[PDB]
């Protein structure tokens, strides 16, 4: 009923993924993209003081909300307008890009 | 130039997310969605034995490959055919959805 997923590394990737059909799960124990986006959001919060709020929710500690908004990877950002979800950004994005997303809804 | 990101939980989401434009970062320290998808992939590996291979790459430990394929959140699943990426699914999906994606390329 279960078979082990085969581990690949930078050293052997090109040899393992060469012929036929492979599905590769890019994963990690810790959330690197979550850490990368955090200071971006802190700078965005300062740039948008008074105009937009920036909040964070840990999905491992808060499964109910994470399930309600169908969060499937992390990080995922949901823009709310007056309590209603109006936009979604999946994964790390540069500050400039997130600003453009906020701007569309201000 | 940095402002603290306000924490929200299952308990207080209703009281905190209510008015104005509000961006919520759904994140975690550990990758809960990565943990949820692993047994699904193990079952898929058994179902597709001898037809497709299922592999995993830890992005923290393997920056070259993670960068080559522009992984921006996790988990990210990429389907390769004869060594070329032909399809991408971002985040946890149920087994039947993943099966449909492999079948398209088999
Ligand atoms: Fe800074
Ligand atoms: Fe900066």
From Swiss-Prot, chains A, B:
Sequence ranges assigned to domain Thioredoxin in this UniProt record: 4-106
Species this chain originates from: Staphylococcus aureus
Disulfide bonds listed in the record: 31-34
GO molecular function: protein-disulfide reductase activity
Identification of the protein by name: Thioredoxin
PANTHER family: GEO12009P1 (PTHR45663:SF11)
Pfam families: Thioredoxin
Family affiliation: Belongs to the thioredoxin family.
Induction, as annotated: Expressed in both aerobic and anaerobic conditions.
GO annotation terms (biological process): cell redox homeostasis
NCBIfam families registered for this protein in UniProt: thioredoxin (TIGR01068)
Disulfide bond as UniProt keyword: yes
Electron transport found in the keyword field: yes
Domain of life according to the entry: Bacteria
Main function: Component of the thioredoxin-thioredoxin reductase system. Participates in various redox reactions through the reversible oxidation of its active center dithiol to a disulfide and catalyzes dithiol-disulfide exchange reactions.
Keyword entries, A-Z: Disulfide bond, Electron transport, Redox-active center, Transport
InterPro entries the record matches: Thioredoxin, Thioredoxin-like_sf, Thioredoxin_CS, Thioredoxin_domain
GO cellular component, one term: cytosol
């Amino acid at each position: 009923s279960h078979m082990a997923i085969v581990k690949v590394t930078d050293a052997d990737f090109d040899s393992k993924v060469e012929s036929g059909v492979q599905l590769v799960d890019f994963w990690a124990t810790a959330c690197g993209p979550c850490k990368m986006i955090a200071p971006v959001l802190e700078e965005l919060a300062a740039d948008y003081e008074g105009k937009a709020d920036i909040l964070k929710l840990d999905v491992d500690e808060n499964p109910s909300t994470a399930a309600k908004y169908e969060v499937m990877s992390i990080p995922t950002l949901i823009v709310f307008k007056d309590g209603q979800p109006v936009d979604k950004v999946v994964g790390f994005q540069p500050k400039e890009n997130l600003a453009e997303v906020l701007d569309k809804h201000l």
